[PDB]
């Protein structure tokens, strides 16, 4: 009944927390941002399309779609760039936007939500940045780079807004608790 | 050089995230709350005491101590132990905020420098039905979790939002705060 339109092992792991059986499937959606598209609009669209793209292969199902980007001074986002990309993040608040869609392919009902999560980075030195790339995992070693994590749900940062998903599931009469 | 003064397997797992060599040892402390001791005073005291209790065993080291308490309507709340008490705790949590205070201490036994901090984390609950409460307890059996839920797992099904500096703090070790203390002692995990 429940389908995750993703082959991400992180998203898979997160969904397993809800203890509802599901199957994974790759959506094969082009995630390239459009010209005048905001971060919020983009992940919203991508979440929806990923869920809707599987509707014929899984035509009597609740299909979960999700997408995430981060914004580094208003820009949507090799080991070579990480040095710069961490250099860009340094001393700044980097906002992640995570879109979520639950599509009922049986009756066409769609629920969507976009949830922000702010990562406040420490002022980093070049050495730190170098050392870190030599060795981001917000649930792991990336904690060494942060001053503060600010958002509704730490699962969102990892890539699936589970609190929001539970609400959507409750609306579809599939409270994980029942 | 780094020592974790803890009998907790999850504190060990969390500290590993920093990728610094350490050893664990069980601390020697009275964990009993004292009379009129507030939740924040308790976890600060216990964190400092755990770290300091290993100073003679580990006299040239950085020693980490930590303690956590769960607070519901101003009252320290322990492990439920029974299903009845688990349902009771969750009724108290329902539509409410559960606050965890996590004390942290780093004691340098070589130069005697002690750093301590208490960091809160607030778990905002949904308004839960009796059926939801009964189902969670039966599925999860959180009988040895103070507050009667597991935030890192199926407990996410109960929450409206999570409010705090660092998700690790909720799991029982404030890692952002610990990193700061380690840097202050010239032991940056990134160095």
Numbering used by the authors:
A (entry chain B): 3 to 79, 84 to 141, 151 to 193
B (entry chain A): 3 to 193
The authors write:
Maf (for multicopy associated filamentation) proteins represent a large family of conserved proteins implicated in cell division arrest but whose biochemical activity remains unknown. Here, we show that the prokaryotic and eukaryotic Maf proteins exhibit nucleotide pyrophosphatase activity against 5-methyl-UTP, pseudo-UTP, 5-methyl-CTP, and 7-methyl-GTP, which represent the most abundant modified bases in all organisms, as well as against canonical nucleotides dTTP, UTP, and CTP. The protomer structures of the four Maf proteins revealed a large β sheet containing seven β strands (β1 to β7) with two α-helical subdomains on one side and one long α helix on another side. Thus, pyrophosphatase activity of Maf proteins toward canonical and modified nucleotides might provide the molecular mechanism for a dual role of these proteins in cell division arrest and house cleaning.
Screening of Maf proteins for pyrophosphatase activity against a set of 57 noncanonical or modified nucleoside triphosphates revealed that the YhdE-like Maf proteins (E. coli YhdE, BSU28050, YOR111W, and ASMTL-Maf) also exhibited high pyrophosphatase activity against 5-methyl-UTP (m5UTP or riboTTP), pseudouridine triphosphate (pseudo-UTP or Ψ), and 5-methyl-CTP (m5CTP), whereas the two YceF proteins (from E. coli and S. typhimurium) were active toward 7-methyl-GTP (m7GTP). The Michaelis-Menten constant, KM, of the YhdE-like proteins toward canonical pyrimidine nucleotides varied in a micromolar range: 32.7–53.0 μM for dTTP; 29.7–72.4 μM for UTP; and it was lower (to a lesser extent for ASMTL-Maf) with modified nucleotides (4.7–47.2 μM). Both YceF proteins also showed high affinity to m7GTP (32.8 μM for YceF and 30.9 μM for STM1189). Therefore, we propose that the unprotonated Asp88 of ASMTL-Maf (Asp70 in YhdE, Asp103 in YOR111W, Asp70 in BSU28050, and Asp69 in YceF) functions as a general base coordinating a water molecule to produce a nucleophilic hydroxide ion, which attacks the alpha-phosphate of the substrate. This is supported by the complete loss of activity in the ASMTL-Maf D88A (and D88N), YhdE D70A, YOR111W D103A, BSU28050 D70A, and YceF D69A mutant proteins. The structure of the inactive YceF D69A protein showed no changes in the position of the side chains of other residues in the active sites, suggesting that the loss of activity in this protein is caused by the replacement of the catalytic Asp69 by Ala. Alanine replacement mutagenesis of the predicted triphosphate binding residues in ASMTL-Maf (Arg24, Lys65, Lys100), YOR111W (Arg30, Lys74, Lys116), YhdE (Arg13, Lys52, Lys82), BSU28050 (Arg14, Lys53, Lys82), and YceF (Arg13, Lys52, Lys81) produced inactive proteins, confirming that these residues play an important role in activity of Maf proteins and suggesting that they are likely to be involved in the coordination of the triphosphate part of the substrate.
